[PDB]
Design a protein around this ligand. Structure first.
Ligand SMILES: *[C@@H]1O[C@H](CO)[C@@H](O[C@@H]2O[C@H](CO)[C@@H](O)[C@H](O)[C@H]2NC(C)=O)[C@H](O)[C@H]1NC(C)=O
Ligand SMILES: *[C@@H]1O[C@H](CO)[C@@H](O[C@@H]2O[C@H](CO)[C@@H](O)[C@H](O)[C@H]2NC(C)=O)[C@H](O)[C@H]1NC(C)=O
Ligand SMILES: *[C@@H]1O[C@H](CO)[C@@H](O[C@@H]2O[C@H](CO)[C@@H](O)[C@H](O)[C@H]2NC(C)=O)[C@H](O)[C@H]1NC(C)=O
Ligand SMILES: *[C@@H]1O[C@H](CO)[C@@H](O[C@@H]2O[C@H](CO)[C@@H](O)[C@H](O)[C@H]2NC(C)=O)[C@H](O)[C@H]1NC(C)=O
Ligand SMILES: *[C@@H]1O[C@H](CO)[C@@H](O)[C@H](O)[C@H]1NC(C)=O
Ligand SMILES: *[C@@H]1O[C@H](CO)[C@@H](O)[C@H](O)[C@H]1NC(C)=O
Ligand SMILES: [Mg+2]
Ligand SMILES: [Mg+2]
Ligand SMILES: [Mg+2]
Ligand SMILES: [Mg+2]
Lengths: 639, 639
DNA sequence: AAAGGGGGTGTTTGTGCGGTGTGGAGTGCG
DNA sequence: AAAGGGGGTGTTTGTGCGGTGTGGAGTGCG
């Protein structure tokens, strides 16, 4: 190898030092590209610009991907929130919101309005007033809109109102309207599990994650108007405004009118590839959402700029600096990401067989520059060692210190959530995924609104160029170290900590497990067997000669199957897309098993004996099968 | 390569010429090994003998596999079939059968007895007397017992009686009792989809294929006694005995008492491996059922003898003749095969992650010598070219002619059925599977009875040694050509015929498809795309250098994914184990789509519009995704 | 009979071929 | 207090360690 890690890192750094990220973001926030709603003309214009840029970079191949998806848009009739008397007579209009929640059911609901803090399950459980047959008003944040709506609907609430409170969203003007989607999932909600291509002819199907109650986003002024008609006083545990109130007066009601209409649109996914020199059929996917409801400077402008600049720099290094990737690099520009990563999920569903054990890592650039105080990572454990090594190399954009300051950062990593485009890659496809951001201690206030302009981003983050340079540096080092080395730099040994944590959590209910005719010895043995398999694999890697391309291919295939073997092989990928037992959603996951067992502990009566027994069996054998497959040949398994 | 195909074929032939198959079968039918019911002491003794033989052959590794499965056995109380009056009073006992149907519901049912020909759906549809609230009596054969019971149960019959008629089973004595199982599936019916290991702790689960009505096998004398109390005359279209009758007299009823009890038993799967010299992690599995209800000479003795002799010959060639397999060879001795390939299916479920894309072919030796007139093959299309090449080489055991006599043999190959141990490998695991037999035009009469002794086999098939030698020759040539060549000898191009046949069958309902807002252009394009992918792969194989181990590994992996890509990625592997869209069972298969569309054509009212639309979408995209994955890299797909 | 349709084969993938009235490769009939 | 239990850590996978009353690696208390 003419270029080693040090020389290639230096080349990446000197490419970054002469890159104008601020100019690219400013160009992406031009009037020719905003507003940039999914399937619009501006979205298609930016897709064509991205495609022409990928062609200008002289990538190995540039190709398009058209999907026809169903999304919700505002009707000609305006959604309205209205205070009505006990007899339904008009009192006074509250607000005709400018924003809306996509995939909210188009319906009119009237009833009492009661306040939940954030819509989390703890907020609903610890709430004095029962939320049934009543509209719940929740504050935006701490969970996705879909989670809030699902939690409210599971308690038989007839509607949801969402607003951004002053404390958590210190926006100066209270009339600002924002956008979200209430689909508890990813992709097109009307083509669950299948690619939504013309080939399917779009059969009548409907995802179970679609809400059945109206959902509406209202401005802070509208929320204060509603609180003016309420009585209860919010608890101090909710660090919210003093104007916030709990329950509507007994002589008033709220009529929520939602009339969003489904629209079928064409979304483009733009791809470019830098084909590898040793193993081109294996690749790292680098993706960034392109669409945005408003201007989307931080929502999609920063990610698209990072994608374009990374593609340019990597093409320059491969073509001019002599960089020779062993694997390929795919640069993906997703569309319809504001509706739940629709483009990425439909691409994953369309090409699942082609991406199976070929794409071994997804890097998400969405909202990578969102602030400057903290560097936050949510990723698969396989990427923890790579992230730690990158953090020890990349300096902080503002302070001269390296990003690696906390030795225990890995124990504070948040699980990937539905709002992240890396979640479909990890939980559904079993491809290790990483999402990182430079963020503050608080959520970005303008994210998802009409004030998410480039001017606001450059005002909130002066020296945005350096922060974007640092984000592109960590992403480029990810790509280089995942693609140039003879080893994949995926740490299968990091799942030993995950299994230990699961065993420790499950040991809290040993009395409950002993009350049933069950035992934890099989899960203990599975944890030990997985550790032994990882140690065997590390010994094999150490013994193998690096120049021997065959044995290293075998070992790298064993490493690539690690994340796939944690997808549940017992649930329907159509009904339960997120089959990952660690990071997926559904009763097949380990957290669901722990939740069911905790329900048994509380003696609430909602515990399901048979469901828990099946969960324990399937989880135990999923872990044991992952260990067995990682160990080696079928005859080498101990039992 | 010191040894080429000709020299190695000659070595195999000269090893076979000095092999005593008759002696091995006679030894396996000794009193120390019969009767050999699953989980019994004789079954364990034969498992230990097989393990000691594998160790004596000096195979690379010999290992065991213990499963604890639930099977049905006869109670202390005898099952009885009784003729009763209209008031339920005893008339006279018909028979206390010596055999039974495993997994039949233990219940007592009384009602009218009506005759269906074989229990096939056509037999029930074309039957004058409605079979509801009545016991149906069917002839054994032409479909599995489970299929008969499911067909009867779907029409609300309260019980099933099975007998072997004189015409189809020319057994001299009419008192012979036989055995079967009524589980519409494979594996342990009480651990559906999961390995049934101690790790699962055996949660409360139940397969949907278990019948809910009593099922009993009765002797021919008992059936004639029952027909003596019947009135109707069977149609001449049923080529059955003249004694057969249709419907019970109006003044008589049949009381069927079944009291089978579940028993948990330990079954052993004995394995031996001959590790390859180039790609040991990939292997061909050669399997044979060991257990049998009776003596099981043809049911399990012949297959086990063939397995032992093949293992001996291949170990001798690898150790003494210099044969150097590129891949490995696994010799598997399954147990509990009489209950629906329980051992093989539980092994597949236990090690699904380890066998995934590692086992690329399963060869089934069960009932390979069952006669001498015909050579019958049921296999995956990927193995059709290998089977044809083997047939052109192997001479017929009796006549000097080669096995390949009919040029159109491939169009007459029967689909693998539930009674075959290769069916779980093909339909569930996506591993190409082959089952062959030397059989007559009629079913083996003693198969599954207490007269399936070695004496009957040697009387019915004189020169059994030569027929067993020919069966071992075709199996050994299968193993050699699948394992020695640098190419896998799997013909992906044979699925072009399957897709053409599917398109031709679907073209019969173009008017019905046009009546709905549907089109077949996507399936036509999928067929063409799959052909283009296969042609591209053949061109790549021709261009690639054989000595280049890396590119050939890549191409062979592309070939190995072919059968796996035809498993439906949209159904639950637990609820629908047989996910193969061609050879599986369920609404996800292409035959199910055709059946639904035919239901639309008949205007019966049972057609499901939404189900058919989803079926068409999912089948179209399964075929298109298989084509896309076979074509190559994701960027090389045309659209 | 005459102008246009559905139903048709089966390797050169072919899904076309609707305009001519049989024929691309294979092939009908109102 | 004394003999035996459930609950406990967290790399040397550790699932053990129940008999001693704290300790394997880490570590309580009736
Ligand atoms: C694929 O399906 C989409 C719709 O799902 C088709 O697009 C529509 O085409 C009709 C007729 O041309 C137009 O009236 C609609 O406005 C289109 N919808 C959109 C969202 O553009 C498309 O034509 C289909 N493609 C193919 C090749 O059949
Ligand atoms: C507990 O979970 C089991 C599933 O493990 C539920 O049983 C299922 O019930 C549905 C109908 O509601 C059936 O279609 C399934 O076949 C059942 N599965 C099994 C394995 O029994 C059961 O209903 C749950 N209990 C409660 C109280 O919700
Ligand atoms: C695995 O489970 C089986 C039963 O499913 C256990 O075997 C039973 O063990 C009990 C107690 O030793 C005996 O009374 C039964 O007769 C056994 N059943 C059979 C069919 O043999 C077995 O002990 C379990 N293995 C482990 C290691 O726990
Ligand atoms: C036709 O098939 C559909 C499935 O494609 C059936 O609809 C399902 O009905 C069950 C309850 O019976 C629900 O749990 C499923 O969610 C439904 N699925 C869908 C996609 O709708 C439908 O019932 C069938 N029709 C008939 C008459 O049997
Ligand atoms: C909520 O449930 C309680 C208990 O059944 C019921 O009394 C109450 O009326 C319900 N709420 C509404 C708005 O009906
Ligand atoms: C079978 O169904 C028909 C139609 O409902 C009914 O009349 C008849 O009684 C049923 N058979 C029995 C044995 O009840
Ligand atoms: Mg036509
Ligand atoms: Mg012609
Ligand atoms: Mg303990
Ligand atoms: Mg210590």
């Amino acid at each position: 190898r003419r270029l080693y890690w040090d020389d290639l890192k230096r080349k990446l750094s000197e490419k970054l030092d002469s890159t104008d990220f601020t100019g690219t973001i400013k160009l992406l926030n031009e009037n020719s590209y905003v507003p940039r709603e999914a399937g619009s003309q501006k979205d298609e214009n930016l897709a064509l610009y991205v495609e022409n840029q990928f062609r200008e970079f002289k990538l190995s191949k540039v190709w398009r991907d058209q999907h026809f998806v169903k999304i919700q848009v505002k009707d000609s009739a305006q959604n309205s929130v209205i205070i009505v008397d006990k007899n339904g007579r008009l009192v006074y209009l509250v607000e005709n919101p400018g924003g809306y929640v996509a995939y909210s059911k188009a319906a009119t609901v009237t009833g009492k309005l009661v306040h939940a803090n954030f819509g989390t399950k703890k907020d609903f459980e610890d709430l004095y007033t029962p939320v049934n047959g009543s509209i719940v008003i929740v504050r935006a944040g701490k969970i996705t809109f879909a989670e809030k709506v699902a939690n409210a609907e599971s308690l038989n609430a007839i509607g949801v109102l969402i607003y951004m409170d002053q404390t958590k969203f210190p926006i100066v003007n209270a009339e600002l309207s924002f956008f979200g989607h209430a689909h508890l999932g990813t992709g097109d909600p009307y083509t669950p599990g299948f690619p939504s291509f013309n080939h399917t002819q779009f059969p009548p199907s409907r995802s179970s994650g679609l809400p059945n109650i109206p959902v509406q986003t209202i401005s802070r002024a509208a929320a204060e108007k509603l609180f003016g008609n309420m009585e209860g006083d919010c608890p101090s545990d909710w660090k919210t405004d003093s104007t916030c109130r709990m329950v509507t007066s007994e002589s008033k009601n709220v009529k929520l009118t939602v009339s969003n209409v489904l629209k079928e649109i064409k979304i483009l996914n733009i791809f470019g590839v830098i084909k590898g020199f040793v193993e081109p059929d294996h690749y790292v996917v680098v993706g960034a959402q392109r669409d945005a409801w408003g201007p989307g400077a931080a929502k999609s402008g920063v990610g698209t700029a990072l994608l374009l600049k990374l593609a340019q720099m990597f093409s320059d290094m491969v073509l001019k600096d002599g960089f020779q990737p062993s694997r390929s690099i795919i640069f993906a520009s997703w569309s319809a990401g504001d509706f739940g990563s629709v483009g990425a999920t439909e691409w994953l569903e369309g090409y699942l067989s082609s991406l199976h054990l070929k794409a071994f890592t997804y890097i998400n650039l969405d909202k990578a520059v969102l602030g400057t105080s903290n560097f936050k990572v949510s990723a698969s454990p396989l990427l923890y060692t790579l992230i730690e090594k990158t953090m020890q190399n990349v300096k902080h954009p503002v302070t001269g210190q390296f990003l690696y300051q906390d030795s225990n950062w890995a124990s504070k990593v948040e699980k990937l959530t539905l709002d992240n485009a890396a979640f479909p890659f990890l939980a559904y496809s079993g491809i290790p995924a990483v999402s990182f951001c430079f963020c503050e201690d608080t959520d970005y206030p303008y994210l998802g609104t009409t004030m998410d302009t480039y001017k606001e981003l450059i005002e909130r983050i002066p020296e945005l160029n350096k922060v974007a340079r640092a984000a592109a540096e960590v992403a480029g080092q990810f790509v280089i170290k995942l693609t140039h080395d003879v080893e994949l730099n995926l740490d299968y040994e990091r799942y030993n900590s995950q299994l230990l944590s699961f065993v420790r959590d499950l040991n809290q209910y040993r009395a409950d497990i002993k009350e049933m005719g069950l035992s934890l010895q099989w899960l203990y043995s599975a944890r030990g067997d997985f550790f032994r398999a990882t140690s065997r694999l590390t010994t094999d890697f150490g013994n193998a000669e690096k120049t021997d391309r065959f044995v290293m291919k075998k070992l790298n295939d064993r490493v690539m199957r690690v994340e796939y073997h944690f997808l549940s092989p017992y649930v329907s990928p159509k009904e339960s897309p997120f089959r990952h037992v660690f990071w997926g959603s559904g009763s097949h996951t380990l957290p669901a098993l722990l939740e069911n067992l905790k329900l048994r502990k509380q003696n609430n009566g909602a515990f399901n004996e048979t469901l828990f027994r099946n969960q324990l069996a399937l989880a135990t054998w999923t872990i044991q099968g992952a260990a067995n497959a990682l160990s080696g040949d079928v005859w080498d398994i101990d039992n």
